[PDB]
Amino acid sequence: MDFRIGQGYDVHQLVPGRPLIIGGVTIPYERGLLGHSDADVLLHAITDALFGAAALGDIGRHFSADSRALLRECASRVAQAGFAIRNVDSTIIAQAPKLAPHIDAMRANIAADLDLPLDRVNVKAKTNEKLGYLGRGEGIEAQAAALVVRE
Amino acid sequence: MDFRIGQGYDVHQLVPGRPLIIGGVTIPYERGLLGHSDADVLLHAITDALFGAAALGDIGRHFSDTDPRFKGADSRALLRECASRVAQAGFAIRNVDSTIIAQAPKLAPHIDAMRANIAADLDLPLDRVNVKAKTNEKLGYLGRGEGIEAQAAALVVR
Amino acid sequence: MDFRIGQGYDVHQLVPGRPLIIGGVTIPYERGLLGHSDADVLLHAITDALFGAAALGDIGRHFPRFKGADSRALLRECASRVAQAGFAIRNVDSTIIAQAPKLAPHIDAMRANIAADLDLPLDRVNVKAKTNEKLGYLGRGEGIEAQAAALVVRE
Ligand SMILES: Nc1ccn([C@@H]2O[C@H](CNC(=O)c3cnc4sccn34)[C@@H](O)[C@H]2O)c(=O)n1
Ligand SMILES: Nc1ccn([C@@H]2O[C@H](CNC(=O)c3cnc4sccn34)[C@@H](O)[C@H]2O)c(=O)n1
Ligand SMILES: Nc1ccn([C@@H]2O[C@H](CNC(=O)c3cnc4sccn34)[C@@H](O)[C@H]2O)c(=O)n1
Ligand SMILES: [K+]
Ligand SMILES: [Zn+2]
Ligand SMILES: [Zn+2]
Ligand SMILES: [Zn+2]
């Protein structure tokens, strides 16, 4: 079968006076992510992995905003290109806040947006062990991998 | 044909007074990795990729400070336990690939031993396990030798 | 069937005085990448992902007969070794992280070079671009990073 893999990366700065939204979950926090749309770093990384697996370019090609609506439209285009999504895995790298209590809700949001069962979606969290701009809490990064199959 | 992919990331600080252990191999060096267990950044990244591919969460969700089974366990015991939980969930491991990013020391003479260790721990043939090494071209905290990063990718099938 | 995955990473410093070559494409810019070969960070990452999927070690283990060889030559040789190991390449995806210059205009050219070198249909090759949102050495324009993923199948 015609399997394809995709990978994605995103990072945004953390700034005061923005809500913190990751994987579609609003997380109580004194800072939020700054950037394109609601700056949901995890959903953007996943979106890039899916477009990448389908060889449809990247998120900026498609979407010159609720990042869940963008993920759903990404999933629609990937399906229209003839691909079915098989699984998604991902990592969020953040010094803070603690993400564990929110991870299951993120997984559920992604699963809903991709029309996948929960057991085909995974979200992992890491600190950066105090190193670099991530260790200093200046931003949050997300990484994603996706497997799709054509037809 | 129910294939799944997983990806893993880890980084630890390099500190004096600790052995450098990567892929289960003790490498001569004036500093070693600081962290959970023996801070084996490569085995941790692989562990997370495998949990990821099986949609089992992550290393921190499985292995706590609170668990007497894993108190002071080295990263190879954890990797073996990861493999156990992946099998328990109905998955077989097909291959692992990885990259260690370290400005220093030279990892080349140690790579095949790392591969051998991982293959043994995962019950895989050598030809389904790969480890690569990169410097960071003196950029950032990696380039300054403040820490070492590892990245991993894993394919499994249910 | 006998699928395998691979992943690749590369980074090079960005300095005045060298041409900027990414994915085989010369891109007009005041600065260029410094490093192994012609420092094509994207082709190097892809090469590493392919050797990784085939469990053949890494680019430095493979590449004397290669002094002065440019990265497309290296990619092509990589592709040959992957095939002789029994693997057919199914797809490649990748991301370039560069604060500047704008890479979008050059993406099709990169994809075309990579697909040619790998003997792949164009629709099995993808290249994405990201800024680093002004964070870190990448965000300050001190270097450019590439990440790659490759899927292969034995026979
Ligand atoms: N050096 C760079 C860096 C980036 N890009 C492109 O610049 C574009 C920027 N990315 C977005 O627009 C974006 C990210 N997240 C969201 S949600 C709605 C749009 N977006 C992408 O196409 C990149 O390919 C580029 O051409 N060159
Ligand atoms: N911002 C963050 C960052 C991390 N974590 C969680 O924090 C957890 C932490 N990590 C481990 O215990 C760990 C890493 N390596 C080893 S070996 C034995 C345990 N471990 C992970 O579950 C993360 O999901 C979190 O909840 N929020
Ligand atoms: N800490 C490190 C870091 C790297 N390496 C090895 O050092 C080697 C360095 N990488 C290259 O030679 C290289 C990268 N891009 C090109 S084009 C022609 C050669 N190359 C790799 O084999 C790594 O395994 C190592 O042994 N120890
Ligand atoms: K990184
Ligand atoms: Zn984003
Ligand atoms: Zn670790
Ligand atoms: Zn390079």
Contacts of C59 in chain B (CB under 8 A): 132
Contacts of A57 in chain C (CB under 8 A): 107, 126, 128
Coil, strand or helix: which one is B75?
helix
Distance CA C35, CA C60 (A): 13
Homologous superfamily of B1-158: 2-C-methyl-D-erythritol 2,4-cyclodiphosphate synthase (3.30.1330.50)
Distance CA A36, CA A45 (A): 13
Report DSSP state, residue C94. Answer: E
Distance CA C92, CA C90 (A): 7
Closest CA to B152 of B62, B56, B41: B41
Q: How far is residue B10 from each of residues A9, B42, C126, measured CA to CA in Å?
A: 15, 7, 26
Nearest-by-CA chain A residue for C90:
A4
Distance CA B98, CA B148 (A): 13
What share of residues in chain C are helix, strand, coil (percent, to 5)? 35, 35, 35
Helix or strand holding residue A59 (H, E): helix A59-62
Contact C155, C2 (CB under 8 A): yes
Report DSSP state, residue C122. Answer: G
Test C91 with A60 for CB contact under 8 angstroms. no
Q: What is the DSSP string of A77-109?
A: HHHHTTEEEEEEEEEEE-SSS--HHHHHHHHHH
Q: How many CA atoms lie within 13 A of B15 on its CB side?
A: 13
Q: Which residues of A contribute to the annotated binding site? A: 10-12, 36-37, 44, 58-60, 63-64, 94-100, 125-129, 136
Q: What fold does the segment set C1-155 form as a domain?
A: 60s Ribosomal Protein L30; Chain: A; (3.30.1330)
CATH number for the domain whose boundaries are A1-151: 3.30.1330.50
Within 10 Å of residue B106's Cβ, how many Cβ atoms?
11
Resolution (A): 1.8
Contact C23, C43 (CB under 8 A): yes
Distance CA A118, CA B15 (A): 40
Question: Which residues partner with B148 through β-bridges?
Answer: B12
Coil, strand or helix: which one is C47?
helix
DSSP β-ladder status, B20-22 and C20-22? unpaired
List of residues 6+ apart from C29 with CB closer than 8 A: C20, C100, C101
Q: Domain ranges in chain A?
A: 1-151
Return the best residue to mutate from C10, C13, C59 for the ligand 3 pocket (most ligand atoms within 8 A of CB): C59
Amino acid letter, A90: S
Interface of B with C (CB under 8 A): 1, 3, 5, 7, 94-95, 97-99, 101, 108, 111, 126-130, 132-134, 136-140, 151-155
Contacts of A124 in chain B (CB under 8 A): 8, 48, 51-52, 57-59
Whether the CA torsion B53, B131, B136, B146 is positive or negative: it is positive
